[PDB]
Design a protein around this motif. Sequence first.
Motif, PDB file in Angstrom:
ATOM      1  N   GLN A 132      37.255  28.429  43.320  1.00 19.93           N
ATOM      2  CA  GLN A 132      38.196  28.932  42.321  1.00 19.93           C
ATOM      3  C   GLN A 132      39.632  28.872  42.853  1.00 19.93           C
ATOM      4  OE1 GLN A 132      36.890  32.897  41.265  1.00 19.93           O
ATOM      5  NE2 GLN A 132      35.308  32.104  39.887  1.00 19.93           N
TER       6      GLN A 132
ATOM      7  N   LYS B  70      43.809  33.134  36.193  1.00 20.89           N
ATOM      8  CA  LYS B  70      43.239  33.455  37.502  1.00 20.89           C
ATOM      9  C   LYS B  70      41.749  33.107  37.579  1.00 20.89           C
ATOM     10  CE  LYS B  70      47.198  35.121  38.759  1.00 20.89           C
ATOM     11  NZ  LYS B  70      48.460  34.695  38.105  1.00 20.89           N
ATOM     12  N   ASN B  71      41.273  32.808  38.787  1.00 23.19           N
ATOM     13  CA  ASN B  71      39.881  32.429  39.019  1.00 23.19           C
ATOM     14  C   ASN B  71      39.452  31.224  38.172  1.00 23.19           C
ATOM     15  OD1 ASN B  71      38.660  33.801  41.172  1.00 23.19           O
ATOM     16  ND2 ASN B  71      38.409  35.680  39.953  1.00 23.19           N
TER      17      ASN B  71
ATOM     18  N   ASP C  20      44.048  29.844  41.708  1.00 23.63           N
ATOM     19  CA  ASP C  20      44.879  30.649  40.792  1.00 23.63           C
ATOM     20  C   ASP C  20      46.133  29.936  40.288  1.00 23.63           C
ATOM     21  OD1 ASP C  20      43.014  32.559  41.292  1.00 23.63           O
ATOM     22  OD2 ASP C  20      44.379  33.986  42.273  1.00 23.63           O
TER      23      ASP C  20
HETATM   24  C1  LIG Z   1      38.030  36.373  41.156  1.00 21.88           C
HETATM   25  O1  LIG Z   1      36.750  36.971  41.090  1.00 21.88           O
HETATM   26  C2  LIG Z   1      36.456  37.716  42.256  1.00 21.88           C
HETATM   27  C3  LIG Z   1      34.981  38.111  42.258  1.00 21.88           C
HETATM   28  O2  LIG Z   1      34.760  38.982  41.167  1.00 21.88           O
HETATM   29  C4  LIG Z   1      37.360  38.951  42.299  1.00 21.88           C
HETATM   30  O3  LIG Z   1      37.128  39.701  43.474  1.00 21.88           O
HETATM   31  C5  LIG Z   1      36.448  40.944  43.201  1.00 21.88           C
HETATM   32  O4  LIG Z   1      37.286  41.939  42.636  1.00 21.88           O
HETATM   33  C6  LIG Z   1      36.585  43.129  42.328  1.00 21.88           C
HETATM   34  C7  LIG Z   1      37.493  44.073  41.553  1.00 21.88           C
HETATM   35  O5  LIG Z   1      37.662  43.584  40.242  1.00 21.88           O
HETATM   36  C8  LIG Z   1      36.090  43.779  43.616  1.00 21.88           C
HETATM   37  O6  LIG Z   1      35.418  44.995  43.340  1.00 21.88           O
HETATM   38  C9  LIG Z   1      35.771  45.982  44.337  1.00 21.88           C
HETATM   39  O7  LIG Z   1      34.797  46.121  45.354  1.00 21.88           O
HETATM   40  C10 LIG Z   1      35.065  47.217  46.206  1.00 21.88           C
HETATM   41  C11 LIG Z   1      34.244  47.060  47.481  1.00 21.88           C
HETATM   42  O8  LIG Z   1      34.523  48.124  48.364  1.00 21.88           O
HETATM   43  C12 LIG Z   1      34.736  48.521  45.478  1.00 21.88           C
HETATM   44  O9  LIG Z   1      35.581  49.566  45.912  1.00 21.88           O
HETATM   45  C13 LIG Z   1      34.891  48.325  43.974  1.00 21.88           C
HETATM   46  O10 LIG Z   1      33.686  47.836  43.432  1.00 21.88           O
HETATM   47  C14 LIG Z   1      36.026  47.348  43.690  1.00 21.88           C
HETATM   48  O11 LIG Z   1      36.156  47.205  42.295  1.00 21.88           O
HETATM   49  C15 LIG Z   1      35.176  42.810  44.357  1.00 21.88           C
HETATM   50  O12 LIG Z   1      34.832  43.316  45.629  1.00 21.88           O
HETATM   51  C16 LIG Z   1      35.839  41.441  44.513  1.00 21.88           C
HETATM   52  N1  LIG Z   1      34.890  40.473  45.046  1.00 21.88           N
HETATM   53  C17 LIG Z   1      35.217  39.683  46.067  1.00 21.88           C
HETATM   54  C18 LIG Z   1      34.170  38.724  46.548  1.00 21.88           C
HETATM   55  O13 LIG Z   1      36.321  39.717  46.605  1.00 21.88           O
HETATM   56  C19 LIG Z   1      38.833  38.558  42.207  1.00 21.88           C
HETATM   57  O14 LIG Z   1      39.558  39.669  41.753  1.00 21.88           O
HETATM   58  C20 LIG Z   1      39.062  37.493  41.135  1.00 21.88           C
HETATM   59  N2  LIG Z   1      40.414  36.975  41.202  1.00 21.88           N
HETATM   60  C21 LIG Z   1      41.258  37.268  40.215  1.00 21.88           C
HETATM   61  C22 LIG Z   1      42.628  36.659  40.289  1.00 21.88           C
HETATM   62  O15 LIG Z   1      40.939  38.001  39.274  1.00 21.88           O
END
Ligand SMILES: *[C@@H]1O[C@H](CO)[C@@H](O[C@@H]2O[C@H](CO)[C@@H](O[C@@H]3O[C@H](CO)[C@@H](O)[C@H](O)[C@@H]3O)[C@H](O)[C@H]2NC(C)=O)[C@H](O)[C@H]1NC(C)=O
Lengths: 46, 108, 109, 173, 172, 172
Positions: C17, C24-25, C19
């Motif tokens: 992916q 995004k993504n 940006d």
């Molecule tokens: C592109 O997609 C990825 C994968 O979904 C996005 O990264 C993810 O973002 C979410 C929040 O929306 C993260 O959730 C978070 O996880 C922490 C772990 O401690 C927890 O406190 C909550 O569940 C929190 O919401 C998730 O971890 C994360 N995944 C990865 C692999 O990084 C990313 O935001 C997206 N990019 C864009 C520009 O949207």
Amino acid sequence: TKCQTPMGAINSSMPFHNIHPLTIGECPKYVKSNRLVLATGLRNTP
Amino acid sequence: DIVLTQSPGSLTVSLGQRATISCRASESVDNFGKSFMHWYQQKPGQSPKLLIYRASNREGIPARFNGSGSGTDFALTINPVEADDVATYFCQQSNEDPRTFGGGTKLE
Amino acid sequence: PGDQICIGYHANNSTEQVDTIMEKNVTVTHAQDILEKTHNGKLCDLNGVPLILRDCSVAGWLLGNPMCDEFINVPEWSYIVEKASPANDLCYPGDFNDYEELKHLLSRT
Amino acid sequence: GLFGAIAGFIEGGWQGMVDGWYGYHHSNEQGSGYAADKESTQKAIDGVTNKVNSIIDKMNTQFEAVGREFNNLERRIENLNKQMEDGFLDVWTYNAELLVLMENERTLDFHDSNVKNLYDKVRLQLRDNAKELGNGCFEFYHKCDNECMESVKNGTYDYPQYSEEARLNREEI
Amino acid sequence: GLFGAIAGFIEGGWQGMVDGWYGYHSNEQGSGYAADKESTQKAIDGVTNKVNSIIDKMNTQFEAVGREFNNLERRIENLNKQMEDGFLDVWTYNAELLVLMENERTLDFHDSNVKNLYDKVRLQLRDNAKELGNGCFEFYHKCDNECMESVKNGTYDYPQYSEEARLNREEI
Amino acid sequence: GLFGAIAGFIEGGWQGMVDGWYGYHSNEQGSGYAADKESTQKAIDGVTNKVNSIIDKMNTQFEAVGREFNNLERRIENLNKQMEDGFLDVWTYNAELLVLMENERTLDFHDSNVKNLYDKVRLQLRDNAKELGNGCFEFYHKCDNECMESVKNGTYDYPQYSEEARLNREEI
Ligand SMILES: *[C@@H]1O[C@H](CO)[C@@H](O[C@@H]2O[C@H](CO)[C@@H](O[C@@H]3O[C@H](CO)[C@@H](O)[C@H](O)[C@@H]3O)[C@H](O)[C@H]2NC(C)=O)[C@H](O)[C@H]1NC(C)=O
């Protein structure tokens, strides 16, 4: 190593790094990003 | 193996003059822009001693020792020669395992 | 019923992916990561050449703190490593004038 | 995208074409198959590669932080020095992030444009000798053997050679 | 603009269409405006993400700090001033330029969405309608309200009207 | 380029047209080149404003100042040097990049003006002429110099030639 930082040494060909700002040697340019990825191909279809 | 050959084998030099010991490497010992040659001094009856690292810089070593050279051949120059310089001198390369030493040169 | 020719473009099993300003993504067929994020967690030699002060400070080293005997005759160094708050500084208390300016001179040495 | 081709009037890419980014799928009596347009693909490869290399090149004169030490009565210049370092680090991080975002967007539209140009390259050759299906495909009004398919693909279509048999087939329709 | 649609081959916008940016009819059942919800929402999402991305990229901007100096610190005072103005001038350029550049792309983005919408209809209608050349297609067959709706939601059944279209083309 | 016209479907420029960037004929009265004054002036205005905007955006650029320091001011000397080089490197990047980016857009801008000009004629002529596919339209009727002038100034009376065009299409 060819590039050293106070947290450890860097073995990379990347033009950027986010390890630590203070480095010595032939180093990638430090940046505060968690991610820098260029699109090279095209939009993929699902 | 990088065969190191020192010359001459034995060298007798007058006090207060110049000793000039040579080293010759079979293949170069010289990349990254620096020479990975080292000179060692073994005063009789004791373990060897470090004089010069990477062919030119002195390790508490008097200036009388001139490390010189590049590539395939080098030279340890002792000048002026003092009394406490009787020893056998060794050059050893670190450019490439297995670490190899010179025959050694005895100074009189 | 009839012969035909189609114009189209590449696709693959990529999940990479990327940006942009408006989106995004964006899953994309090929991408290049240009950010290095890993190091070996170690202090190392630099191109075959560092002076590690351990528990000594630069003052302690240069003035010759007796607890700093390791550095009585140190070889050429590439860079110098000093802890944040070294134990072995000025064993007898006092000051080192223009100390910072002296550390600066060192860093050019 | 900007040019209406990729995920546009051509709704989808081909897993089947693997020797390039843009190309053709033909279908005649001799049989069907995918083939990449080597020319437009190489042009894009050169363009994107120069782009990547230009981005990495423009960044060689970037700021490089230097360790500097200060004492308890040099807090002002310590802070000035810190602001200066963070200052440039923040600028160059913006420059790298933005450059990547901007050129990514242009790259996706660049591919879109190469495709739309390829489609137009064929269309402008075929003219009334074929029918625009409207999905990236042209249905021929004549017989197009493999060699004819190859002439469309390398820009040497002899329009008038097939003009008559095309015109006749249009008119019974 | 870049794509020849807005203020181009479609010479003018419609005060009458108010439920969207881009859209469409005139048959026997009557005429009226309607927005293409899909292409409009796409543009709204794109522009909104753009605006939000611009504001986002600026959070790590320079922030000036008050610092004081005495009569024998004029040099670092001036250095400090040059540094502050230095970054203030850089970031002002960055904000001004970013806005100018993305404005230009935004106008052309709308132009492109329109030209794509026109092409979406054109590629469906083919020879079943005539390109008037002003953003309008004159049909070679009867297009009731439900038919109008099929063109608008991309479900035009070309072959269903193919025959009655072809016959109407040929008496012409 | 981005729009497929310059060095695209129109494979080559004309040394012969010299009174403008973009333009146009061949009839019985004779042939000749002529520049489209309108699209040319638009491009000239656009590029000129672009050049002037680039030079304008750079007036608040960094200006290095001579500053002196002694042997015990090596730190702020170096800080001062890093600051100066720092801004000099930033602004050099900004000027180099801006020129590279706007150059690319400028070439594509011309490509777009051409493709729009071609479309301007095409949308007027419709079935009254044949797309040769090289930037040229072969007419299905007689186009005298005054007719040529109507195509060039956007006043082509399509229906006036519609009948004689249609008749000439159908013996073909
Ligand atoms: C592109 O997609 C990825 C994968 O979904 C996005 O990264 C993810 O973002 C979410 C929040 O929306 C993260 O959730 C978070 O996880 C922490 C772990 O401690 C927890 O406190 C909550 O569940 C929190 O919401 C998730 O971890 C994360 N995944 C990865 C692999 O990084 C990313 O935001 C997206 N990019 C864009 C520009 O949207």
